[PDB]
């Protein structure tokens, strides 16, 4: 079955069903990833190193500010998550490069 | 080997090393979870239903707005992630119960 069969928050993009197909185009509100990341998703060779700087589900849940709003027949859940990374973290420069790569 | 040996964004809380130990106390900037969730972390019996409404790491990477600010010797990365859940989603009411649960503790009846 396709990733579009799943709720948007459970999708995992790959070459076969990519970031554009699962989510949408890169834009200022959806801003991570160069064209390699977009095309290949979690299959991109840089993804495992990038994933060292992504919170896990427990951390997202317990260490976020979470808010809600009604939008038509949905409830919009906003997770605002902050993490403090040392400037000498080995994985930080690679991740900074991917922030708004679509504009760079 | 303590979860405190891992970066704060990769910790997984349990009764042994709970939410307060791994993260910090519930407040308005860290607002999810009742006292059972706080005590038992991912081993709380309510957690799997809550997990149905938490994005995965690839969804959070590719489907958030991400920014950075310098804070001294560190860089703060902010993820702001928005998801639309159908009002008839059967897992939604449990999630909502947990939002700022610290404001609404159980009365003690015995």
Contacts of B59 (CB under 8 A, 6+ apart): A8, A9, A10, A11, A12, A23, B81
Residue A4, token pair as written in the block: 């579009």
Resolution in A: 1.5
DSSP string, chain B: --GGGS-GGG----SSS-HHHHT---BTTB-B--HHHHHHGGGSTTHHHHHTTS--HHHHHHTSEEEEEEETTEEEEEEEEEEEEETT-TTHHHHHHHBTGGGSPPPP--
Is B64 in contact with B81 (CB distance < 8 Å)? yes
- Method in brief: X-ray
Residue A48, token pair as written in the block: 């495992």
The shortest C-alpha distance from A92 to chain B (Å) reads: 9
Burial of A80 (0-12, 13-18, 19+ CB in 10 A): middle
Question: Bridge-partner residues for B3, per DSSP?
Answer: none
CA A80-A3-B92 angle, 5° bins: 45
The DSSP symbol for B106 reads P
CB contact under 8 A, A64 and B32: yes
The CA distance from A70 to B32, in Å, is 19
Q: For chain A, what are the domain ranges? A: 1-104
3-state secondary structure at position B53: coil
DSSP string, A18-48: -HHHHT---BTTB-B--HHHHHHGGGSTTHH
The CA distance from B110 to B108, in Å, is 6
Within 10 angstroms of residue A27's Cβ, the number of other Cβ atoms is 11
Task: Report which secondary-structure segment, H or E, holds B69.
Answer: strand B65-71
Is B66 in contact with A19 (CB distance < 8 Å)? no
CB contact under 8 A, B84 and A71: yes
3-state secondary structure at position A4: helix
The shortest C-alpha distance from A2 to chain B (Å) reads: 15
Contacts of A57 (CB under 8 A, 6+ apart): B51, B54, B55, B56, B57
3-state secondary structure at position B56: coil
Residue A53, token pair as written in the block: 């700087």
Would an 8 Å CB–CB cutoff place B108 in contact with chain A?
A: no
The CA distance from B4 to B18, in Å, is 11
Main-chain dihedrals φ then ψ at residue A56, nearest 5 degrees? -75, 170
Within 10 angstroms of residue A103's Cβ, the number of other Cβ atoms is 9
Residue B46, token pair as written in the block: 């309510």
Residue of B nearest to A12 (CA): B58
DSSP string, A44-101: STTHHHHGGGS--HHHHHHHEEEEEEEETTEEEEEEEEEEEEETT-TTHHHHHHHBTG
Closest CA to A47 of A13, A81, A16: A13
The shortest C-alpha distance from A100 to chain B (Å) reads: 8
Which of A8, A62, A87 comes nearest B73 by C-beta? Answer: A87
């Amino acid at each position: 079955p396709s990733q579009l069969k799943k709720p948007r928050w459970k999708r995992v993009p790959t070459r076969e069903e990519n970031v554009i197909q699962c989510f949408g185009p890169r834009d200022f509100n959806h801003n991570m990833g160069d064209s390699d990341l977009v095309q290949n998703g979690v299959d991109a060779k840089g993804f495992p190193q990038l994933a060292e700087l992504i919170p896990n589900q427990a951390a997202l849940f317990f260490d976020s500010e979470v808010s809600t709003d009604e939008v038509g027949d949905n409830v919009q859940i906003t997770y605002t998550y902050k993490m403090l990374v040392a400037k000498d973290n080995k994985n930080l420069p690679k991740f900074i490069e991917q922030i708004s790569a679509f504009t760079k």
